[PDB]
Point group: C2
Chain length 123, copies 2
Amino acid sequence: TLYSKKDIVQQARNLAKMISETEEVDFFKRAEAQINENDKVSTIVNQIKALQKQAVNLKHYEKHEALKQVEAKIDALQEELEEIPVIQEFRDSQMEVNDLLQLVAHTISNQVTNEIITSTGGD
Amino acid sequence: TLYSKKDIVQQARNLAKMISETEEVDFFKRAEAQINENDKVSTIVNQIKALQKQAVNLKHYEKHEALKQVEAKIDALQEELEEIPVIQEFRDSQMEVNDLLQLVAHTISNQVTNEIITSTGGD
């Protein structure tokens, strides 16, 4: 009997659980732990939050010129955030995990095509 | 010990082999067999081929007006091709397989995030 879509979904979840037990995701997890504890990241994320609250207010009241300044402040803070060591580590771990996922997707896609070819021969 | 990228790739290939043994891919395979044997599809695909050969020639010699006619002929034939029953079946099977693959990708992506959350808690 053929695998049902339901079987495949369960098997895909099993693959994901193993993917979550790779050095890549292990890196992402400890990196994430470090940015949740870093004080500088906390200070900056809060300031950004506060400014985004003002932004919504300024646009409501159509304070365009004032909005531009708040937006400049947010851009300034976001770039500062990315300069932070633990943030750089986090971004690096994110990429490692996203690249791994893409590899899995390509592998699955390419293997399916191979299996279909070996079974049919292509059209 | 954590799974290595290599382990994951192998496991992804195993998932693909099972995916290739679903009703979806089984549908794609018998649909593909039918268009490779259909005479009308063969006639049209060959005519399209021949015209694409003329197209390359016309553009080389810069026969723009003439190229436009050859391109119109190709469009006419392609649409005729899609009207063919066995082709409609093939397109339907292709979608079933592509939708299944997308589901697998989403499932893997969403389960990884869940596993990371249950292990860390998110950032």
